[PDB]
């Protein structure tokens, strides 16, 4: 927390003045969109393993200055940006649906370099 940081050190990236709850209502959203995905999905178990877990201290600890080393994710103003891509990514494999078997096995021994 403390005095609002004038600049985050990355041009284009802006300092958000309400970062803790922005992480909160983002982090709920991936948990929300994860609801559609099946339980057997490998994505979901990994998602919930780091979503509400990392929703933990941000819910508990409110000082973003201490929150830097809570997630080892760098500056908070890009962590919420990173959470945005995770929310974005969750939408992506809501369509890819990758837990089916391979579309096609690799044709003959194409791999196995050298030739």
Partner 1 sequence: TQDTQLIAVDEKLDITTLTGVPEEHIKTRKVRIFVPARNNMQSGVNNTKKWKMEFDTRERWENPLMGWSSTADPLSNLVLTFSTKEDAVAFAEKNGWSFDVEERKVPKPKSKSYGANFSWNKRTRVSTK
Partner 2 sequence: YIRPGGVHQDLPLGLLDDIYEFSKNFSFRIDELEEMLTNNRIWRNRTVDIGVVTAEDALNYGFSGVMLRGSGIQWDLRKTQPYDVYDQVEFDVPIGSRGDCYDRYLCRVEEMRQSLRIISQCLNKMPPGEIKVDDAKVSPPKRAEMKTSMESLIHHFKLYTEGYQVPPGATYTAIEAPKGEFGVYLVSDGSSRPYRCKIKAPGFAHLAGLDKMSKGHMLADVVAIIGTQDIVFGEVDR
Partner 3 sequence: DTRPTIRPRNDVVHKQLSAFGQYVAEILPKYVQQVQVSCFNELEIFIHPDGVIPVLTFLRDHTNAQFKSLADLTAVDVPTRQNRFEIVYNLLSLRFNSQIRVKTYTDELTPIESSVTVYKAANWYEREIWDMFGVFFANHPDLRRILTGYGFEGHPFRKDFPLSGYVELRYDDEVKRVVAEPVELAQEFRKFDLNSPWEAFPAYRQPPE
| Binding-site partner at residue 10 among partner 1, partner 2, partner 3, none, CB < 5 to 8 Å by type | partner 2
CB-count exposure of residue 28 (10 Å: 0-12, 13-18, 19+): middle
For residues 12 and 7, give the distance between their C-alpha atoms in angstroms, rounded to a whole number. 10
43 binds, among partner 1, partner 3, partner 2, none (CB under 5 to 8 A by kind): partner 3
Q: How far is the CB of 115 from partner 2 (least distance, A)?
A: 8
104 binds partner 1 (CB under 8 A): yes
Among the candidate windows 1-9, 16-24, 56-64, 78-86, which touches partner 3 by CB under 8 A? 78-86
Cβ-in-10-Å burial (0-12, 13-18, 19+) of 6 comes to exposed
Cβ atoms within 10 Å, residue 30: 22
What x/- string results for residues 71 through 100 when contact with partner 2 is judged by CB under 8 A? ---x--------------------------
Angle (CA) 66-71-74 rounded to 5° is 80
Nearest Cα residue to 80 out of 9, 4, 28, 5: 28
Which residues are at the interface with partner 1 (CB under 8 A)?
Answer: 103-104, 115
* Interacting residue ranges for partner 3, rule: CB under 8 A: 42-43, 46, 50, 73-74, 82, 85-86, 88-89, 92-93, 96-108, 110-111, 114-115
């Amino acid at each position: 927390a403390g005095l609002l940081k004038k600049t985050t050190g990355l041009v284009g990236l802006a300092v958000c003045e309400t970062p803790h709850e922005r992480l909160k209502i983002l982090y709920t959203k991936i948990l929300d969109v994860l609801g559609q995905i099946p339980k057997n999905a490998a994505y979901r178990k990994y998602t919930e393993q780091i979503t509400n877990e990392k929703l933990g201290m941000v819910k508990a600890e409110p000082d973003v200055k201490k929150l830097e080393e809570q997630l080892q994710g760098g500056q908070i103003e890009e962590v919420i940006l990173q959470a945005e891509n995770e929310l974005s990514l969750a939408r992506k494999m809501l369509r890819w649906k990758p837990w089916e078997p391979l579309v096609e096995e690799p044709p003959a021994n194409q791999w196995k370099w050298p030739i």
